[PDB]
């Protein structure tokens, strides 16, 4: 028999990491 | 017939969240 | 023929942006 159809789409990627903390605040 | 070719690659993951506010500024 | 195997997992999402500056000092 002829080759089957293409498989299902793969899983969505893992989420990106949360960004780092901001820089130190203003002096005043 | 033989199995079809592998499916398409998954979509990109979610973007990461914006990081938290930075540490407090120096006293003054 | 039967459907092919599932695709590979996608790329990881982009990293988040750096947070905003902290509050003013006391």
Name the residue facing C17 among B1, B11, B19 (closest C-beta): B19
Residue with tokens 């790329």: C11
Q: Cα(C5)–Cα(B9) distance, rounded to whole angstroms?
A: 11
Which residues of A are less than 8 Å from B7 in CB distance?
Answer: 6-10
Would you state the torsion angle of the CA atoms of residues C17, C23, C25, C26, taken in this order, to the nearest 10 degrees? -160
Resolution (A): 1.5
The answer to whether A28 and B27 have CB atoms below 8 angstroms apart is: no
Chain B residue with minimum CA distance to C13: B13
Q: Cα(C15)–Cα(B22) distance, rounded to whole angstroms?
A: 17
Chain C residue with minimum CA distance to B5: C4
Q: Cα(B25)–Cα(C18) distance, rounded to whole angstroms?
A: 17
Q: Cα(B26)–Cα(A23) distance, rounded to whole angstroms?
A: 12
Count of alpha carbons within 13 Å of A11, Cβ hemisphere only?
5
């Amino acid at each position: 028999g002829p080759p089957g159809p293409p498989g299902a789409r793969g899983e969505r990627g893992f989420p990106g990491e949360r960004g780092p903390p901001g820089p130190p605040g203003p002096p005043g």
